[PDB]
Design a protein around this nucleic acid. Structure first.
Length: 48
RNA sequence: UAUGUGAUGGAACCUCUCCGGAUAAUUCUAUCUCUUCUG
């Protein structure tokens, strides 16, 4: 079967590289920014 | 805690009346699970 163009998209690459397994706090407000990878199109396409 | 020439209290059955009863086949097929990234 043919594998479609999936991984070289910048969003998938930055999501996979950004592990952030530790440094997670379950209390108080978080300090994160919408660091979209060179993409400003619409909402819901971002990350913390 | 008595008071004295006079105490059958051994002088009285907690007795009598009332179905632990009623209802129930030890039986058996449809999913489960939510975040995917422009496609």
């Amino acid at each position: 079967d043919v594998p479609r163009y999936n991984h070289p998209t910048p969003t998938d690459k930055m999501l996979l590289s950004l592990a952030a397994y530790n440094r997670n706090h379950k209390h108080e407000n978080g300090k994160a920014e919408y660091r979209i990878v060179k993409p400003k199109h619409n909402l819901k396409v971002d990350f913390m």
